[PDB]
Write a protein that binds this ligand. Structure first.
Ligand SMILES: [Mg+2]
Ligand SMILES: [Mg+2]
Ligand SMILES: [Mg+2]
Ligand SMILES: [Mg+2]
Ligand SMILES: [Mg+2]
Ligand SMILES: [Mg+2]
Ligand SMILES: [Mg+2]
Ligand SMILES: [Mg+2]
Ligand SMILES: [Mg+2]
Ligand SMILES: [Mg+2]
Ligand SMILES: [Mg+2]
Ligand SMILES: [Mg+2]
Ligand SMILES: [Mg+2]
Ligand SMILES: [Mg+2]
Ligand SMILES: [Mg+2]
Ligand code: NA
Lengths: 45, 295
RNA sequence: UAUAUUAAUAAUGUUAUGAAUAAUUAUUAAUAAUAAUAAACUAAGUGAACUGAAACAUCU
RNA sequence: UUAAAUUAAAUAUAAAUAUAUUUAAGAUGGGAUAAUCUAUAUUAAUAAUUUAUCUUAAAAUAUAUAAUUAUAUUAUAUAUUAUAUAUUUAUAUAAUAUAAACUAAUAAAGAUCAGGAAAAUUAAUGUAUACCGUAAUGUAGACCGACUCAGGUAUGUAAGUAGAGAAUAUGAAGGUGAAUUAGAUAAUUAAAGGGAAGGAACUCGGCAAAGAUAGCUCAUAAGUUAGUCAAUAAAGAGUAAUAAGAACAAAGUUGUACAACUGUUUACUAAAAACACCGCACUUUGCAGAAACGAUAAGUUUAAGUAUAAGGUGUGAACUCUGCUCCAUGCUUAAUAUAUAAAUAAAAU
RNA sequence: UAAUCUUAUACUUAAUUCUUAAGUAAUAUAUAAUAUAUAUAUAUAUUAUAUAUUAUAAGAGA
């Protein structure tokens, strides 16, 4: 039985999608800049 | 002593099999080595063998079929023997990281320990030596167990570990039961001709080390793993046949029913699997003198 | 760990022998500090494909 | 494992970057002491893969006539009493004290599949003890499933009675009785219970549903690869039971085809004769290798391995076996036969 | 084979450390002279002059 694909764990989620993860890599930086340009309020977890 | 030796030679290594109470136990067949030590290796001479799963530094399987065997400790074994001086063999152990048995030497002047690959008839209590550092009449030198440059070994003598360069360690004939033979010696060129376990006759530098005798565990060849599980324990994941796949995956893939699809036997990446020589043209073993028997 | 360390001194308590050693406070001097920074425009490197050709590969 | 981080020139690469090497980060693991309660700071000197704890031996208890037979006990875990040594507090000794389970610690030891990595002692001087987590929910109305969703979700304790058990029955204690009720129970549906005479006449097909005469102890053939494999054999017996009388474990024998077998597979229509396999065979590669990956490179996996190894390929345990054929497509060795591409003088029209 | 490639591993002076320059000592190599031993050749010792302080070893090698 599918449907329950997101299996929350705070550690994994901060480590993968978190602000610090984004800011550490060049690709991540691009993403953050993109979100800033769009004016998103929340740049990442 | 001679009589004892003869007796030992006569005595064959028995092949243990359990009662076939399970269908997998039916074909498990292992050689017994009772003189082979029971216990552990010296922790100061082992390092963890870190499992790769056959994955390269890309994270991608580069070599198929490697996988999750038992945990394993690598034994640092001396393929060099730069020490010199007598050494008493304390015990002969099982090494999971190779097919040969290993021998734990204690050097007598110092009490310092080292592992060697075990020669065929080597036993605990025996004494061996190394002659990399020259000699300090002749036949006492040449006897199963001791290493020396090829320059010092009589022509025709069977040897196992064989270096390539003088400064270098023994690269050839280290697996269970294997051995090479010195065919000729040429001082003027500084080369000797060795025939390796395959049958190729190859040039090797004169000062290159070799240890006399045949590699131990000659009966390793005959061991029959009885069940799939045993392979898995050895870190060997299953191989899937090209013919059982689809064309996207293998040249042999597809077809309704089993069929080779009139396609020459080849690898998943298309190179030919029967006969096609892979080292070819310019790149080739210069020191090849006489080639291996078949191809 | 700049309510930092080092040096110099000043009052203070202890020890061993007016001189010597360590502890705390207070003044003076010396010694480093902090990449939040646009976007479009310009130049350069690499450089598709869909598409058009009423097919397609030269071409586009 | 990760890291625009770190070596005129670390190495490689259209850029992005990639690589080995150092440095730092990184728990799911390791980390002094301690109710006869305990002090981590500063300065100076020179572990453990799994698994079992049998047999023997010792001493103890009863029969019989030191020695035999039968039985239980046998490494550790406290309290009480009585003793000898420092002086009621200490040390050691002796005697007394249930069962079957469990825990931890101890020692010894069998198997092959051979079993983590990383941060010293003494002396002197010290200590005012930081920060954060802490509700409740957590086999669920409090998480993941669009819903207060019969799904998914990790660990420990899990009263007794009974029994081989965490089976099955009950349930002491605790918890719960719910965002639908009340009646009525037609036809009809679902989930059950029973059924005379028949007993597969049903049906594609005994599908479904019946069907268990000990779960302990004996006893168990043919066949066979010699493995109580077949076997939990069928049948049959012992104890229990004489027609009234819990629940759960336990549902037959034989032939053939296919596949040796335990396994794996189409998450959500296919579990198989398909994949895998152990074994068999062929082959490439001598290590400055072969194979794979690498805008391609350095370089990685191969491997701290070295031909009884490693890569690839077919077949797929074992028993009896594997006939004939290189025409063709390849590979492979040998030459001579023999053409051609780019690349050159200097010199002729 | 000093093509290419592979692998392993002291003082003085001048602008606390760094760099230059001079000389002297130390070690190595090359050339020259003298003395001795052996069969024009080889070996050792002494003296003079020049050069060096990425290396060494191993391997492949036009
Ligand atoms: Mg969703
Ligand atoms: Mg990632
Ligand atoms: Mg298929
Ligand atoms: Mg067919
Ligand atoms: Mg441009
Ligand atoms: Mg750390
Ligand atoms: Mg629910
Ligand atoms: Mg009918
Ligand atoms: Mg019918
Ligand atoms: Mg049942
Ligand atoms: Mg099957
Ligand atoms: Mg199904
Ligand atoms: Mg077969
Ligand atoms: Mg093979
Ligand atoms: Mg097949
Ligand atoms: Na095929």
């Amino acid at each position: 039985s599918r449907g329950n694909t997101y299996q929350p764990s705070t550690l994994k989620r901060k480590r993968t999608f978190g602000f610090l993860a984004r800011a550490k890599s060049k690709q991540g930086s691009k993403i953050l800049k993109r979100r800033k340009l769009k004016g998103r309020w929340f740049l990442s977890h | 002593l001679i009589k004892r030796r003869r007796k030992l030679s006569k005595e064959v290594t028995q092949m243990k099999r359990l009662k076939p109470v399970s269908p997998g136990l039916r074909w498990y067949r292992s050689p017994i080595y009772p003189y082979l030590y029971k216990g552990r290796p010296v922790r100061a001479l082992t390092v963890v063998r870190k499992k790769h799963g056959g994955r390269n530094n890309s994270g991608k399987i580069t070599v198929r079929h490697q996988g999750g065997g038992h945990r394993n400790r690598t034994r640092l074994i001396d393929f060099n023997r730069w020490e010199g001086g007598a050494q008493t063999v304390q015990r002969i152990e099982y090494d999971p990281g190779r097919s040969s048995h290993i021998a734990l030497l204690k050097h007598n002047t110092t009490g310092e320990l080292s592992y060697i690959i075990a020669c065929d008839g080597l036993r605990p209590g025996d004494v061996v030596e190394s002659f990399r550092r020259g000699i300090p009449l002749s036949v006492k030198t040449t006897q199963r167990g001791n290493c020396l440059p090829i320059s010092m070994i009589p022509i025709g003598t069977i040897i196992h570990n064989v270096g390539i360069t003088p400064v270098g360690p023994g690269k050839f004939c280290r697996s269970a039961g294997t051995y090479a033979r010195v065919l000729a010696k040429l001082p003027e060129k500084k080369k000797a001709i060795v025939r390796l376990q395959s049958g190729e006759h190859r040039y090797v530098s004169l000062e290159a080390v070799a240890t006399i005798g045949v590699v131990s565990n000659i009966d390793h060849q005959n061991r029959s793993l009885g069940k799939a599980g045993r392979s898995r324990w050895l870190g060997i994941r299953p191989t899937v046949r090209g013919v059982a796949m689809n064309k996207c995956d293998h040249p042999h893939g597809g077809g309704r029913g089993k069929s080779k699809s009139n396609k020459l036997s080849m690898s998943p990446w298309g190179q030919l699997a029967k006969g096609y020589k892979t080292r070819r043209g310019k790149n080739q073993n210069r020191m090849k003198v006489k080639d291996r028997p078949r191809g």
